[PDB]
Amino acid sequence: GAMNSSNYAELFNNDIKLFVDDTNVYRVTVHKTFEGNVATKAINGCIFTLNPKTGHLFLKIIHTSVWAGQKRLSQLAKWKTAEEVSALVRSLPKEEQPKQIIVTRKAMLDPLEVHMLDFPNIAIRPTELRLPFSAAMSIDKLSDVVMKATEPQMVLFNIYDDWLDRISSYTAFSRLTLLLRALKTNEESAKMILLSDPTITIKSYHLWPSFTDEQWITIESQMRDLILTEYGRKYNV
Amino acid sequence: MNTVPFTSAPIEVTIGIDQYSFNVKENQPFHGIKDIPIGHVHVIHFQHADNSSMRYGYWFDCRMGNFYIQYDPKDGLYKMMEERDGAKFENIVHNFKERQMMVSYPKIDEDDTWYNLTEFVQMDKIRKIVRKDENQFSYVDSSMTTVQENELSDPAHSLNYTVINFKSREAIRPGHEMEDFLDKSYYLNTVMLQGIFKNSSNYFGELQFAFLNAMFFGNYGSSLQWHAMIELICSSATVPKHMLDKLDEILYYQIKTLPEQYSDILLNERVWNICLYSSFQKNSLHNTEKIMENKYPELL
Ligand SMILES: Nc1ccc(Sc2ccccn2)nc1
């Protein structure tokens, strides 16, 4: 059924699986019209599809043109996500298709289930984990490509950089979710932590800085401080 | 008017005929039911005094033969049988009426309830849902499962209702996934009506038969089917106007006839609230909504 703290290590076994996050698919700015009414203006979005074992991220950019002339866009967005995921699975060789797709929001279950009827053997699952993938647009290189796009486009990224050379998928995913949780809780502080030292650079082919093992420990500790901190500044503790 | 005689009543049993019922005591001089209206299907049903488990019964149409009931002490139930010796049958029936050992089908003359519950139900279709072609009548009981319930185990003893599944390739056209899931009109009008049922009368006939099996036998799979067939209509933006009008009349009499005390188990909160207050047809079922709100406002 659902994915949670009890069956967490299943993400790192050798059954191919994908997380899908649709949070950033339909994005808007709300503003006042000359007549003083309110209106929305859509901006580009993205589907966040990640294989947690390898770090392979299929970033499908959703150009605002897809909304033109459409109604009930928040509902459409869930179906559009499912259509694009389904198209992705169909484009993969059979031996690369996932055995499970895990959706981060329960509202994607029916849209994905219906678009995947052709694949009765791919399990569509929810999760009780509160994953921070919405913060993916706080990763500068991902936000950049999304906002620059002039048409629909699939960008391919390894969200773990080269970490798997040195650590396991379980640890790499833990690092990733800690970073994204921190970016989600206080983006400024989080980004300050990551970039404060100008001698540690992000490689052109990477998303995150080239920290050594020791430096990642320091960084990881500082992000935990941050998340505890904002948890006091928010709950006055 | 026609008659279903009983050889005898060796065990205490509550007998139903359509929406009527009466108690027969162990070895009471009971020889059957008379004055049964010709022109309608009927159901005669049983619940033993000892083992209220297993309600069971027989759908029949008196125009299709002379039928009687006889207890089987080996199998332990009241069995329906057909008498082929037409002469023998009228002789038997006449003797039991002269001795007045029969109960009279107790139809009030103002009362169209049974007609309204069975308007579209036809023996021929019942026999296709309940497969046992050597008998002109059909046995149903509480425990019989449906073909869809078996996909989810004795195929000879099943209710072969039409399978409806909203997340199925039959229900969903490629390229219309969102359209067809949110608005079921394609599935209702093209796949089911035109494709399978052929007309709305056969559709309504299965719907009413499903309801009746749920109410008389507490048959869970029949209840599931009745709600599915309502939900398919209620969730279709485009339904012929006469069908909606008739559906409102069908459902009205079903809700009217339901035992007040069985509503908690026979009525699906989600389907009804969806159909009456959210679906495309939320404003189309005026009679049904009024009787539901006055009789089962807790459910809503
Ligand atoms: N920079 C980079 C680009 C592509 C790849 S390969 C790949 C294939 C499919 C999905 C994700 N990554 N690995 C690293």
UniProtKB/Swiss-Prot annotation, chain A:
Outcome (variant: residue 22 to N): Reduced growth at 30 degrees Celsius. Strongly reduced growth at 16 degrees Celsius
Effect of residue 104 to A: Reduced growth at 30 degrees Celsius. Strongly reduced growth at 16 degrees Celsius
Region described as RNase H homology domain: 7-237
Protein's cellular compartments: Nucleus
Additional information: Present with 468 molecules/cell in log phase SD medium.
Subunit structure: Component of the U4/U6-U5 tri-snRNP complex composed of the U4, U6 and U5 snRNAs and at least PRP3, PRP4, PRP6, PRP8, PRP18, PRP31, PRP38, SNU13, SNU23, SNU66, SNU114, SPP381, SMB1, SMD1, SMD2, SMD3, SMX2, SMX3, LSM2, LSM3, LSM4, LSM5, LSM6, LSM7, LSM8, BRR2 and DIB1.
Function text: Functions as a scaffold that mediates the ordered assembly of spliceosomal proteins and snRNAs. Required for association of BRR2 with the spliceosomal U5 snRNP, and the subsequent assembly of the U4/U6-U5 tri-snRNP complex. Functions as a scaffold that positions spliceosomal U2, U5 and U6 snRNAs at splice sites on pre-mRNA substrates, so that splicing can occur. Interacts with both the 5' and the 3' splice site, as well as the branch region. Has a role in branch site-3' splice site selection. Associates with the branch site-3' splice 3'-exon region. Also has a role in cell cycle.
Domain notes: The MPN (JAB/Mov34) domain has structural similarity with deubiquitinating enzymes, but lacks the residues that would bind the catalytic metal ion.
Name of the protein this chain belongs to: Pre-mRNA-splicing factor 8
Naturally occurring in which organism (per UniProt): Saccharomyces cerevisiae (strain ATCC 204508 / S288c) (Baker's yeast)
Source organism phylogeny: Eukaryota, Fungi, Dikarya, Ascomycota, Saccharomycotina
GN (gene name): PRP8
Curated annotation (Swiss-Prot), chain B:
Keywords: Cytoplasm, mRNA processing, mRNA splicing, Nucleus, Phosphoprotein
GO-annotated cellular components: cytoplasm; U5 snRNP
Family: Belongs to the AAR2 family.
Residues making up the signal peptide according to the UniProt record: none
Location of Phosphothreonine modifications: 257
Alphabetical GO biological process terms: spliceosomal snRNP assembly; spliceosomal tri-snRNP complex assembly
Subunit note: Heterodimer. Interacts with PRP8 (via RNase H homology domain and MPN domain), competing with BRR2 for the same binding site. Component of a U5 snRNP complex that contains at least the U5 snRNA, PRP8, SNU114, AAR2, SMB1, SMD1, SMD2, SMD3, SME1, SMX2 and SMX3, but is not a component of the U4/U6-U5 tri-snRNP complex.
Known outcome of mutating residue 236 to D/E: Disrupts interaction with PRP8
UniProt miscellaneous comment: Present with 7330 molecules/cell in log phase SD medium.
Chief location of this protein within or outside the cell: cytoplasm
Record flagged with keyword Calcium: no
Known function: Component of the U5 snRNP complex that is required for spliceosome assembly and for pre-mRNA splicing. Involved in splicing pre-mRNA of the A1 cistron and other genes that are important for cell growth.
Pfam families hit by this protein: AAR2 (PF05282), AAR2_1st (PF20981)
Gene name of this polypeptide: AAR2
Name this protein carries in UniProt: A1 cistron-splicing factor AAR2
Modification Phosphoserine occurs at: 236
Subcellular location: Cytoplasm; Nucleus
Post-translational modification (record): Phosphorylated on serine and tyrosine residues.
Sequence segments annotated as region (Leucine-zipper): 244-265
Highest taxon above the source species: Eukaryota
Keyword check for DNA repair: no
Source organism of this protein record: Saccharomyces cerevisiae (strain ATCC 204508 / S288c) (Baker's yeast)
